[PDB]
Design a protein around this ligand. Structure first.
Ligand code: SF4
Length: 335
């Protein structure tokens, strides 16, 4: 339009969450960066997946000719570690034992995101530095950053980074996608996972405990493709959990000795038992259903955070209040 912008700046300066219904594909990155100047020193774009880094990179290279700004993004350890294979979870990455953990290089973000990451992996192996910690370090300095939904909304991933969100104007584009944040975790335990953990194991005691757990699971689960409540779920004592936990560490040590980090199945199991809640049977698997969508989005109610939501098909005010649980004052602008 013009300068619905002083509206946005005033909105943010009054601690209103700004919800912007905007016709799509219209220089949105430039708009957000301009309105940040007046509000916050840095900008954070929260995006669905790492595939949304590229369009942001494309848009602000145009901006970089008129204004000097640094862009950085975070990809997980599984996408940046020198030794990671497909299937490797972030906690499986054995940085505790790796010589490169404290080996950082200065990153130059004139490359696109996939180009940058591939270059850091190639150079990292030759010149002995860690791509991940190099990206992480570059992230903490940058004027504009971008993170994926898991790193912003999900505790498991949020604990991997050390970032004060109060320094950022937080922009969540395609914000209708926030509706799916409650589908990003799966908190389940299957027969096959346990058996794969038995195969992968490096101690008899761990195999014995995993085997007893496999049996316990079989008594409670039911074959029905239907959620059914379970009384008396399997139990692991503190001392049994100790033995399963040092088995995890032994597999992590061994993997780093090889060039090669794979999925460690016992990690999944131990994380399932951190949550114990009402547990269910679904299709021979034990499941803890995910929280409601408002549990994940509750963070948006903290008045300490300056937040803009934008979308072409933003949900009605009523739905954002009742279903997403946004109870903080909201400046809803239909452009
Ligand atoms: S290279 Fe080493 S330090 Fe870097 S992520 Fe992989 S394990 Fe960790």
């Amino acid at each position: 339009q013009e300068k619905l912008k002083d509206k946005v700046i005033e909105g943010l300066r009054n601690n209103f969450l700004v919800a912007l219904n905007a016709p799509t594909g219209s220089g949105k990155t430039l708009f957000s960066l301009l309105v940040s100047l007046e509000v916050k020193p840095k900008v954070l774009f929260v995006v669905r997946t790492h595939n949304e880094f590229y369009p942001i990179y494309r848009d602000l290279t145009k901006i970089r000719e008129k204004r000097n700004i640094t862009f950085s993004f975070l990809v997980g350890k599984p996408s940046s570690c020198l030794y990671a294979e497909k299937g490797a979870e972030s906690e499986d990455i054995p940085c505790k034992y790796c010589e490169l953990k404290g080996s950082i290089v200065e990153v130059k973000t004139d490359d696109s995101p996939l180009s940058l990451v591939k270059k850091l992996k190639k150079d990292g192996l030759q010149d002995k530095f860690c791509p991940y910690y190099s990206l992480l370090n570059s992230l903490y300095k940058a004027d504009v950053i971008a993170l994926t939904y898991p790193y912003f909304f999900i505790d498991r991933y949020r604990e991997f980074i050390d970032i004060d969100l109060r320094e950022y104007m937080i922009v969540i584009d395609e914000a209708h996608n926030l509706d799916k944040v409650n589908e990003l975790e799966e908190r389940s335990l299957s027969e096959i996972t346990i058996q794969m953990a038995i195969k992968q194991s490096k101690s008899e005691e761990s195999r014995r405990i995993l085997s007893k757990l496999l049996n316990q699971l079989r008594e409670v689960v039911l074959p029905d493709e239907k959620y059914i409540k379970v009384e008396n779920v399997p139990k692991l004592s503190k001392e049994e959990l100790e033995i399963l936990a040092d088995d995890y560490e032994d597999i992590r040590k061994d993997s780093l000795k090889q060039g090669k980090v794979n999925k460690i199945h016992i990690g999944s199991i131990l994380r399932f038992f951190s949550l114990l809640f009402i547990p269910f049977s679904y299709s021979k698997r034990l499941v803890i259903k995910n929280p409601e969508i408002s549990y994940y989005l509750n963070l948006l109610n903290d008045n300490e955070l300056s937040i803009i939501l934008m979308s072409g098909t933003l949900p009605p005010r009523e739905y954002m209040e009742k279903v997403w649980g946004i109870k903080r004052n909201m400046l809803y602008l239909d452009v």
